Amino acid sequence: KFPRVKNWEVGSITYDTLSAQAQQDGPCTPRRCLGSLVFPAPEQLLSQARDFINQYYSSIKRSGSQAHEQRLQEVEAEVAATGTYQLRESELVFGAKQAWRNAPRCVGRIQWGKLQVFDARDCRSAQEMFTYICNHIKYATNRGNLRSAITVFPQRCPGRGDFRIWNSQLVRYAGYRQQDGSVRGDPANVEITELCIQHGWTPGNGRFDVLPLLLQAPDEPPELFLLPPELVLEVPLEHPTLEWFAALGLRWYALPAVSNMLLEIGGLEFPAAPFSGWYMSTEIGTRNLCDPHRYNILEDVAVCMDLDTRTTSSLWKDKAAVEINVAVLHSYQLAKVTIVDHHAATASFMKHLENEQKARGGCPADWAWIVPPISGSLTPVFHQEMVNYFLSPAFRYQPDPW
Amino acid sequence: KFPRVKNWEVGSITYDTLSAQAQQDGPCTPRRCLGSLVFPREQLLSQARDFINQYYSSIKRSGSQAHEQRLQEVEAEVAATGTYQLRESELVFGAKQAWRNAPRCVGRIQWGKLQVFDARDCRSAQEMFTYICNHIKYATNRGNLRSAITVFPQRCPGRGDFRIWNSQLVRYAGYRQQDGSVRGDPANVEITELCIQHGWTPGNGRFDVLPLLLQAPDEPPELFLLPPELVLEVPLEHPTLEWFAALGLRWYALPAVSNMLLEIGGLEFPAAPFSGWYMSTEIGTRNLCDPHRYNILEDVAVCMDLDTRTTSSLWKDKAAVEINVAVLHSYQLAKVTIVDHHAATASFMKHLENEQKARGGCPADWAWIVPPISGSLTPVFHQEMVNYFLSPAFRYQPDPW
Ligand code: HEM
Ligand code: HEM
Ligand SMILES: CNCCc1cc(F)c(F)c(OCc2cc(C)cc(N)n2)c1
Ligand SMILES: CNCCc1cc(F)c(F)c(OCc2cc(C)cc(N)n2)c1
Ligand SMILES: C[C@H](O)[C@H](O)[C@H]1CNc2nc(N)[nH]c(=O)c2N1
Ligand SMILES: C[C@H](O)[C@H](O)[C@H]1CNc2nc(N)[nH]c(=O)c2N1
Ligand SMILES: [Ca+2]
Ligand SMILES: [Ca+2]
Numbered sequence: 012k013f014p015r016v017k018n019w020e021v022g023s024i025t026y027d028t029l030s031a032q033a034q035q036d037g038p039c040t041p042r043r044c045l046g047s048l049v050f051p052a053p054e055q056l057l058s059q060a061r062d063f064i065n066q067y068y069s070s071i072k073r074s075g076s077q078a079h080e081q082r083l084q085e086v087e088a089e090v091a092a093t094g095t096y097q098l099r100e101s102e103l104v105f106g107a108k109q110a111w112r113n114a115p116r117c118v119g120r121i122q123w124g125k126l127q128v129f130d131a132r133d134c135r136s137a138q139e140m141f142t143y144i145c146n147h148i149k150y151a152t153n154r155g156n157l158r159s160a161i162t163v164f165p166q167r168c169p170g171r172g173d174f175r176i177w178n179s180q181l182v183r184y185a186g187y188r189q190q191d192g193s194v195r196g197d198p199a200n201v202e203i204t205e206l207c208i209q210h211g212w213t214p215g216n217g218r219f220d221v222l223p224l225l226l227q228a229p230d231e232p233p234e235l236f237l238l239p240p241e242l243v244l245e246v247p248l249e250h251p252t253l254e255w256f257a258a259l260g261l262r263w264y265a266l267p268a269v270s271n272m273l274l275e276i277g278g279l280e281f282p283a284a285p286f287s288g289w290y291m292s293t294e295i296g297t298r299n300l301c302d303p304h305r306y307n308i309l310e311d312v313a314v315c316m317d318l319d320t321r322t323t324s325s326l327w328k329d330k331a332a333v334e335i336n337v338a339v340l341h342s343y344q345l346a347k348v349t350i351v352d353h354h355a356a357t358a359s360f361m362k363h364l365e366n367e368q369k370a371r372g373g374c375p376a377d378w379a380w381i382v383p384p385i386s387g388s389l390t391p392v393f394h395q396e397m398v399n400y401f402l403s404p405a406f407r408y409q410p411d412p413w
Numbered sequence: 414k415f416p417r418v419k420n421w422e423v424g425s426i427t428y429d430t431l432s433a434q435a436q437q438d439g440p441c442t443p444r445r446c447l448g449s450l451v452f453p454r455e456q457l458l459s460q461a462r463d464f465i466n467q468y469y470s471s472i473k474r475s476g477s478q479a480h481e482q483r484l485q486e487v488e489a490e491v492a493a494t495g496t497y498q499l500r501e502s503e504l505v506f507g508a509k510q511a512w513r514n515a516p517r518c519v520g521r522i523q524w525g526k527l528q529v530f531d532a533r534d535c536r537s538a539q540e541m542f543t544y545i546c547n548h549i550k551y552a553t554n555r556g557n558l559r560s561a562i563t564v565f566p567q568r569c570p571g572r573g574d575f576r577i578w579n580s581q582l583v584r585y586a587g588y589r590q591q592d593g594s595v596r597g598d599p600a601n602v603e604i605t606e607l608c609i610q611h612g613w614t615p616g617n618g619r620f621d622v623l624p625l626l627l628q629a630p631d632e633p634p635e636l637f638l639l640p641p642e643l644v645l646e647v648p649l650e651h652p653t654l655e656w657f658a659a660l661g662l663r664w665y666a667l668p669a670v671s672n673m674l675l676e677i678g679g680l681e682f683p684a685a686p687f688s689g690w691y692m693s694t695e696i697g698t699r700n701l702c703d704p705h706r707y708n709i710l711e712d713v714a715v716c717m718d719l720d721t722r723t724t725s726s727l728w729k730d731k732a733a734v735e736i737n738v739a740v741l742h743s744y745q746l747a748k749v750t751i752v753d754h755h756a757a758t759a760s761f762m763k764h765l766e767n768e769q770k771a772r773g774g775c776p777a778d779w780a781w782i783v784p785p786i787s788g789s790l791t792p793v794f795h796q797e798m799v800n801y802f803l804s805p806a807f808r809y810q811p812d813p814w
């Protein structure tokens with residue numbers, strides 16, 4: 012029998028038949044669960060590509076057709092003579108969508124089918140890589156009306172180095188290790204900040220200094236690239252009724268563009284394939300601004316609110332956090348930048364699970380990442396039991412290139 | 414082999430070496446992780462042996478004197494009966510261990526101070542009800558809560574079990590209406606109609622304290638009404654929103670779970686109620702704001718003059734905070750022990766640090782340690798955890814029908 016999952020709010024029961032098709036293996040054994048840990052080729056390449064090809068011909072309802080037959084044999088032959096193969100442009104488009112659809116920690120998969128795939132498999136240098144990124148940013152930002160997108164740079168192949176983007180996201184704020192042990196700016200970006208300087212960049216001294224891009228072309232050092240300021244949409248944060256809030260001088264960028272995972276399709280590995288959608292307000296308001304080890308503003312906002320930060324039973328942390336989230340949602344809507352609050356995001360996610368159950372009979376979901384970082388049990392995914400597993404195509408974590 | 418565990422807030426690293434002694438098997442496989450599911454699913458000498466070894470090493474009387482004799486004592490008892498009797502001191506230690514080993518409990522910093530009430534000499538349901546009321550009075554203590562557990566007779570072969578049919582000792586009723594919905598606590602719809610089927614005459618309020626359905630071996634259960642001066646309750650009011658008290662909301666003081674089986678040394682106690690004191694989110698977020706419980710959130714939001722027709726006003730977040738503020742203020746007013754999730758999580762962090770030095774790790778189920786509001790504002794959000802089952806432990810068990 013398959014895992015039986017319960018929804019507690021509604022009382023309903025499903026079985027995840029899909030998890031039986033899980034390819035790569037995860038960290039949990041019957042002895043102990045590790046589901047909370049953040050970071051846990053000839054004939055096996057064939058059986059991966061074969062499985063992918065079948066996936067592609069199932070999607071279009073033409074499985075077993077002569078063309079499906081022929082493409083499998085076509086892939087079998089290219090693997091024999093070269094050791095690898097190339098995806099058709101259609102298989103790449105469907106592949107990238109599959110990788111998003113399968114990402115178990117992403118709460119926005121209701122949108123997985125509307126994804127703009129930019130094919131950069133012919134990219135030749137770091138200079139063409141920057142050109143391609145700017146086009147991505149331009150297209151996805153779209154002057155505030157955000158459009159999901161991914162750009163796929165050339166696949167890993169033996170003999171040659173990988174294309175890589177050393178930056179973890181396309182838009183990132185500098186983190187200047189302050190001399191007194193602290194940080195001015197974003198502390199998550201202290202190491203990449205040190206690398207940018209060392210690689211030629213003249214640092215600022217603000218707190219929302221946009222980092223340049225380090226782009227590395229195969230078997231080359233990374234080259235330094237500055238984003239055009241008008242290409243990088245930013246939102247100053249102000250609060251609809253707390254008017255001193257604007258004097259905090261808080262800003263955040265419009266476009267979340269993850270640039271350092273590996274996209275894996277049919278056994279082929281793309282080390283550089285940045286993707287981007289639109290923000291959920293709690294990533295900005297709760298995690299990026301209030302995490303103790305991020306901008307950590309939550310005490311400073313509460314003191315401004317005249318809360319009693321002396322005892323925890325006033326729930327000043329909770330009150331100041333809510334208001335910082337109100338400000339994000341309001342400032343982004345004022346600027347007419349796409350954004351989704353965690354109640355909308357999680358309710359649409361429940362619709363995705365219902366779709367995926369009709370469609371594939373399951374959906375890999377990582378509870379600790381789907382449940383938002385405030386107001387958890389107030390959203391419907393709290394009460395939803397989930398099964399976590401690894402399907403391919405997938406986005407995967409990969410070592411930092413340095 | 415030894416899971417590496419990281420605190421992302423600090424950057425600290427430890428290795429859980431205690432996980433290797435995982436007595437049982439949980440629900441997860443290399444293929445799929447089920448750590449989000451609420452319930453999964455002679456050789457007694459081995460479990461019995463292993464518990465005694467824990468005991469004596471625990472009091473530093475390791476594998477020596479009274480150790481070697483206790484071993485051959487229980488071997489002989491099981492040879493003659495099929496089962497064996499715990500020493501009372503062992504009983505104390507296995508209770509505190511079972512609490513210490515419960516991975517979903519954030520309150521384990523308190524695992525040293527626990528009041529064990531030996532009720533193994535208990536026969537008939539009227540003695541049950543007496544044993545229960547002493548417990549309730551001892552633990553309520555006029556609002557200064559003291560953790561405690563009473564242990565009723567263990568399961569033995571060829572026999573019947575002592576069962577408290579009630580999931581908790583304090584449970585508000587839940588009457589179904591011909592309009593399909595519920596007046597009261599929906600969680601308790603099934604127990605309420607059992608109280609009625611087996612005798613009780615129903616009230617009609619949103620907070621009618623149920624009767625107890627206590628059951629003796631090979632006998633049906635009997636209702637027992639609790640004396641209302643024993644069941645300490647807290648009317649809920651808000652420190653500044655004067656209208657809150659008029660909503661008529663009220664919770665009880667003593668969290669007392671009465672339907673989990675206790676396991677010690679291969680012995681199973683199908684009736685052993687335990688109690689501590691509440692963490693405010695249990696009442697204010699889960700019991701009152703969960704869509705399938707009292708589900709009061711939208712009522713408070715309306716009274717608060719909040720914009721309830723667009724999700725981005727975070728009206729749900731604001732109304733939930735104030736319901737918690739009301740809980741924390743109403744318990745302090747009545748001098749009833751309560752703890753907020755910020756204090757409770759910071760204490761659980763200390764307990765991890767303790768347990769790292771004492772036992773080399775600590776079984777913890779992240780989904781249940783992290784509070785259900787302001788998750789990432791508490792320090793246990795940023796702490797990787799390892800979940801596993803050690804014995805002694807508390808286990809869920811099937812209902813007696
Ligand atoms: C369109 C709006 C989208 C929203 C609102 C959204 C939401 C989220 C959120 C809240 C997370 C958790 C991030 C964290 O806290 O670490 C996440 C993770 C993730 N997202 Fe999405 N997402 C969107 C689009 C996309 C797209 C277009 C892709 C890829 C094509 C994608 C792939 C992923 C992956 C692989 C992860 C897991 C990576 C990680 O968090 O370590 N998402 N998403
Ligand atoms: C300081 C006192 C205590 C606090 C603050 C506390 C807090 C909590 C919380 C928040 C939970 C999760 C609630 C849930 O799962 O719905 C829990 C669960 C649990 N606790 Fe504690 N608790 C305390 C005392 C105790 C005692 C005295 C025992 C046993 C002797 C115990 C054993 C357990 C068990 C077995 C669970 C299982 C959760 C479940 O059944 O769903 N706790 N505790
Ligand atoms: C402190 N949190 C961890 C930061 C973090 C690390 C990653 F590796 C991510 F992949 C990520 O995803 C962010 C994201 C991506 C997309 C496409 C949409 C969206 N709404 N959010 C966030
Ligand atoms: C909707 N959630 C499920 C409700 C629930 C189910 C159980 F089976 C429990 F065991 C439990 O125990 C909660 C508890 C126990 C003690 C002794 C102290 C404390 N503060 N909390 C709560
Ligand atoms: C240690 C803990 O698992 C870690 O901080 C995770 C938990 N869940 C999360 N969930 C989301 N969405 N984002 C995160 O960064 C995290 N962090
Ligand atoms: C599906 C999910 O695991 C389930 O709702 C859990 C999550 N965390 C919880 N945490 C606590 N404290 N109590 C609960 O009942 C739950 N329920
Ligand atoms: Ca070709
Ligand atoms: Ca009717």
Ligand SMILES: [Cl-]
Binds near residue numbers: 267294299
């Ligand atoms: Cl981010």
Ligand SMILES: [Cl-]
Binds near residue numbers: 668695700
């Ligand atoms: Cl409760």
Ligand SMILES: [Gd]
Binds near residue numbers: 252253254
């Ligand atoms: Gd104002």
Ligand SMILES: [Zn+2]
Binds near residue numbers: 046445446448
């Ligand atoms: Zn697991």
